[PDB]
């Protein structure tokens, strides 16, 4: 807190920058726990205040129902709330939120199968297509492709995609079968 106060009140100071790098780790650790607000002080000036935010308080604030309460309060104070009473409504909301967060801290006492089935279907149905490469079909086709044939080339190029589409159909069928067997 001392170092942060000094850094913010002396923005351009290389000597202070050095200590900031030396204390980066400590500041990184205490960054979540360090609070910072601005108030109009007794000297009729805007003063910045540093305090401590606790881990329990932050977790209770980040719990979803508290976020819903915050959203509802902002909606209300923006739509029907007035400017003259805004800071009174905000303080009342803060008090209620603080009480409920303390109560929650007090009361607190110290699909995967479908994904796996889909992965298995993908692996099986793609290995089925990949086994077509080691069947020595290419070795046998070498002698027959020694002679060039444009029609043969186009036919094979179409047949590759036809096989791909057939494998996709098999994948869809396998996924449906596995999903039904699971839900049964």
């Amino acid at each position: 807190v001392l170092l942060t106060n000094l850094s913010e009140h002396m923005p351009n100071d290389t000597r202070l920058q050095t200590f900031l790098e030396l204390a980066e780790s400590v500041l990184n650790y205490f960054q979540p726990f360090l609070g910072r607000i601005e108030i109009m002080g007794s000297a009729k000036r805007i003063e910045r205040v540093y305090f401590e935010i606790s881990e329990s308080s932050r977790t209770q604030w980040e719990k979803p129902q508290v976020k819903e309460s915050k959203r509802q309060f902002i909606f209300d104070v923006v739509n029907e709330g007035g400017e003259k009473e805004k800071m009174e409504l905000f303080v009342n909301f803060c008090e209620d939120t603080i009480f409920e967060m303390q109560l929650a801290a007090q009361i607190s006492e110290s699909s995967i199968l479908t994904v796996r089935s889909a992965l298995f279907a993908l692996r099986y149905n793609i290995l089925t297509l990949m086994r077509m490469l080691s069947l020595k079909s290419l070795k046998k086709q070498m002698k027959k492709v020694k002679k060039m044939t444009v029609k043969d080339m186009v036919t094979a190029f179409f047949s590759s995609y036809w096989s791909i589409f057939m494998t996709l159909l098999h994948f869809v069928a396998s996924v449906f079968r596995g999903f039904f067997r699971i839900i049964c």
């Binding site: 109009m40 805007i46 800071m87």
Partner: protein, 96 residues
Amino acid sequence: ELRDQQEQVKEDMETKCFICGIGNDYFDTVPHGFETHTLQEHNLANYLFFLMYLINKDETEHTGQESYVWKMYQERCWEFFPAGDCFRKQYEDQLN
């Protein structure tokens, strides 16, 4: 009407700070200035945490600023909240 009210809430929160009420343009004269101001300098969550800290802290143990805010809060007086002013406006020339 409900849709328009939600849009109005979003626009107000995106274009002016909840606490001070200054527009986003003045803060955005510095890059990322508006969200920096609304998440570090004038965060409403920070004010709520300060109220919790000030309530839970012992009365004898308060510092001068804490005692000042505490007495104004007890007497229900909300001028410690910055209205139309901030650190960047107090020290505009010194900061840059």
